[PDB]
């Protein structure tokens, strides 16, 4: 702010002001609020809580069976070298 003498800035907005209204009042709000609809315990989703496999491992079962059977052919006898 600058004040300049001799033209000085009025020393106030004075008493000639026009009170325009008495509408100043905010009427307090008084209220009762009830949000009470029956609630049912459940919601349907496509899927909740699953941690789906991105790849599975290979998996398997097992079997064996049979017996011990055989047809054989042997090497001929040979002269013994030494000993």
């Amino acid at each position: 702010a600058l004040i300049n003498p001799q033209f000085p800035y009025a020393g106030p907005v004075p008493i000639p002001g026009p009170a325009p209204t008495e509408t100043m009042p905010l009427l307090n709000y008084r209220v009762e609020g009830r949000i009470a609809g029956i609630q049912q315990a459940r919601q349907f989703m496509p899927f909740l809580q699953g941690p789906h496999r991105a790849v599975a491992e290979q998996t398997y079962h097992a079997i064996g069976t049979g017996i011990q059977m055989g047809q054989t052919f042997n090497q001929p006898l040979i002269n013994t070298q030494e000993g």
């Binding site: 600058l2 004040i3 300049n4 003498p5 001799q6 033209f7 000085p8 800035y9």
Partner: protein, 49 residues
Amino acid sequence: APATIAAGATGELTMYYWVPLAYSETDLTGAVLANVPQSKQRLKLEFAN
């Protein structure tokens, strides 16, 4: 300004006036502080007709 304006002619004139507030460029006696109010100045001019 043309010394004479003959019948049917149009003359062109130029005039300058200095309206002083301050006495001179170095003597500010009479100068006006105008940055101190919103109140307006009035420079009234009445021209020839």
